[PDB]
Each structure stands twice: as C-alpha cells, then as structure tokens.
C-alpha cells in the first residue's frame, strides 16, 4: 500500500506550485504606486528571489536526509510552507513581498528534494517509478493551472486578503495528512552511507541529466518576466488576459507529462528527451514572428508539451544511473536535478535584460533557441556501461 504516499507527494507539489502563481493577479497592484517583448526590472527581482534562494538550499538537504530521514523534512516544508502564506496574508510592502518569497523558496526546495527521494526509494520497479514520477510531476502543472485563475476572479469578488487566508486552510488540512501517514515523531538514518556530491558531479553521464533540463527551463525562463502584461497603465485595454496568460504552459504541461512517463520506457527514454528538446528549439524559434500578443499562444503550447516531454523522461534516468554505478541512495542525486531545474530562474532575469541592453530582445530568443538544437545530438549518449 505504497500508492497512498505518492498522493502526499502529488499534494506537496500542487499547492505549493499554486502559491507562486496565486501571487500574480496581485503583482502589479503595489509595482506601480512599442515592441511586444519590453523588459520590467521590478519583476525581474521577484522572479529570480525565490529561485535564488532554493538553489543555495538546495544541496544542504540531500545530505540532511541521509542522517535524518526523509519525514522531518518534508514535515518541516509544510511548516515553513504554512508561515510564508501567512505573512503574505498581511504583506503589504514590496520588500515584505521579497521576504515572504524568500521563504517559500525555501520550503519548496524542502519539499521537492525529500519527497522525490523518498518517491524513488520506495517504487524501487523501474518502469514502475517511471511511471509514478511522471504522475507526481503533473502536480506542478495544476498548481499552474489552478493559482493564477482561483485567484483574481475572488481577490475582486470578495476581498483583497481572502486568497491567502482561504488557501493557508487547505495547507492546514494537509499538515493533518503528513502527521497520519509519515509520522515524524522517531528520527532514524538510513543503511549505508550515500555516495560524496563531488564524485556525482564528476561524472558525465549525470552532467548531461542535468544539462537537459536547465536548457529547456532556461530558454522558458528568459520569456515569461518580458511580457505586456505586467504593464500598469490605463492605456491598457483590459485584465481578462492577466489570470489566462498560464493556461498554455500548464494545460500542455499535465498531458506531455503524464503521457510519456509510461510511454517513454516502451520507446528509447534516450529517443523521447532529444526530440524533446528539437520540438522546444523549433517552437522557441517561431517567438520572434509573434507581432501581436496571441501570436504567443501558438509556441507556448508547444513550448511546455516537450519540456514535459524532458522531464517525465530525464528524471528517473537519475535515479537509475546512480542505483546502476554508484551508491543506492536517492537523496543528493535529486537535489542536482532540482538545481538543474532552478538555475534557468536563477540566472534568466538578469543576464537577459543585459542582452536586451546589447541587441534586440527578439536576437536573445534566436540563440536560446539554436543552442537547444546543438545539445540535441549529444542525449544519444544515454546509453549507460556499468
Ligand atoms: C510569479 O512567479 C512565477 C510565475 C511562474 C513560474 C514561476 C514563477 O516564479 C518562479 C513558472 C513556474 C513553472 O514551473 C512553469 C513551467 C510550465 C512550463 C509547466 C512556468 N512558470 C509559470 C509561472
């Protein structure tokens, strides 16, 4: 009875997805008092904040659950997770603002490192955690999905404090969950001792793992803070778009990663992710040619399907290299990848404004795009010795 531990998982990615994308029918409320891809700072420095931060916490807990378990810290995010909505439940300020991003980053990384762990070293069956995986990574596209819509239509239907406080009782609800199931009272340490980050890090056929998913997440993250609709002005026509503007991410998104992750073991998991990033270099490459805000809509879709398509595929690859070459333990192995997954945020804003101020904003997307196609090829080399 295994399968009810991944619902817990599923739910600490969904809501946790869903606070970060709540926040942004708010954003421009409290950021103000002819090309379509103009460049904002002021939002730019919320974006890479949270990201910022997970990436430093993100390797202090893969050594953490090899000597103290995978429970407490997953039970310490929902901690975490639960203060963060709070404070923004009375942020008014748009450094309180930063600082209750901050520790929400901190929390997901908490959550994203511990339980995928413990969601591989249970499904042990390699089809099996593929498939699983690719279950529990649909969370994050209904947190996409749902917190940008179930926000603004009630933040203006009821109150400006209501999004928070309603949302900080399901978080609540689910502590209840994590105290039933998991049970954090008896700390203990696992088997046998995990093998040294360096000597993970040293090795290519990770490198690669790794490099696939920061491309992809890199070339999504240098389009999504450029956009018009962080533009306050009443020139602006109308809000309908903010609160939709994430339905094309999202909705791709759940489908490529559900579909694939029993799909790609039939195939090559090697075949799925190069097409993968092919598909997500030709989409990428048509954003230049958009000339109106709904020539976006096209790539989008496209966009989030293959990077579902990389990261249903690449993540138990992980799992799988470090069960065939090095030690069995789980724990480091993920936090690279998350790191992988976060860098893209991390790094996005600013280096892309900088090559805004150097050439064209359009030029930016003509080389994200070829570099994808050019670390295409070398995913054949997948095929593992040992
Ligand atoms: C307002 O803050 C944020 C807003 C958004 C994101 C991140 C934010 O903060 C880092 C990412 C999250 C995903 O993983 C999404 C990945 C999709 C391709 C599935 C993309 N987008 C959406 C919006």
Redesign the pocket.
């Known amino acids: 009875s295994r399968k009810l531990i991944l619902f817990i998982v599923f739910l600490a990615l969904l809501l946790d ?1 869903m606070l ?2 709540v ?2 029918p708010i ?1 421009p409320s409290y950021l103000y008092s002819k090309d379509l891809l103009n460049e904002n700072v002021q939002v730019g420095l ?2 890479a904040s ?2 910022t931060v997970q990436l430093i916490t993100n390797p202090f807990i893969g050594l953490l659950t090899n000597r103290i378990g995978y429970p407490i810290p997953i039970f310490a995010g929902f901690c975490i997770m639960f203060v963060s909505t709070i404070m923004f439940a009375f942020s008014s300020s748009y450094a309180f603002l930063l600082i209750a991003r901050s520790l929400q980053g901190i929390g997901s990384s908490c959550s994203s490192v511990a339980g995928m762990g413990m969601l591989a070293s249970v499904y042990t069956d390699d089809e099996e955690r593929g498939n699983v995986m690719g279950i529990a990574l649909g969370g ?2 209904m947190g ?1 999905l749902v917190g940008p819509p179930f926000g603004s239509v009630l933040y203006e239907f009821v109150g400006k404090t209501a999004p928070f406080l309603v949302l900080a009782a399901l978080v609540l609800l689910d502590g209840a969950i994590q105290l039933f199931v998991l049970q954090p009272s008896r700390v203990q340490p696992e088997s046998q001792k995990g093998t040294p980050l360096t000597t993970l890090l040293k090795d290519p056929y990770i490198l690669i793992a790794a490099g696939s998913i920061c491309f992809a ?1 890199m070339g ?2 240098m389009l ?1 803070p450029a956009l018009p609709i962080w533009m306050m002005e009443t020139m602006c026509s109308r809000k309908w778009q903010l609160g939709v503007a ?1 339905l094309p ?2 909705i ?2 759940l489908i490529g990663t559900n579909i694939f992750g029993i799909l790609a073991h039939k195939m090559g998991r090697w075949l799925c992710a190069l097409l993968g990033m092919i598909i997500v270099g030709v989409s990428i490459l048509c954003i230049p040619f958009a000339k109106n805000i709904y020539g976006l809509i096209a790539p989008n879709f496209g ?2 399907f293959a ?2 398509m990389v990261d249903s595929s690449m993540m138990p690859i992980m799992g799988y290299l470090v069960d065939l070459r090095h030690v069995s333990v789980y724990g480091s192995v993920y936090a690279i990848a998350d790191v992988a997954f976060c860098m893209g ?1 991390a790094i996005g804003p600013s280096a892309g404004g900088a090559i805004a101020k150097a050439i064209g904003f359009p030029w930016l997307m003509t080389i994200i795009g070829i570099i994808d196609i050019l670390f295409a090829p070398l995913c054949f080399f997948l095929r593992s010795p040992p």
């Open positions: 997805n970060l994308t926040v942004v954003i919320l974006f949270k990201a994050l596209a996409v997440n999504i993250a999504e994430f991410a999202s791709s998104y966009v989030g990077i579902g945020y």
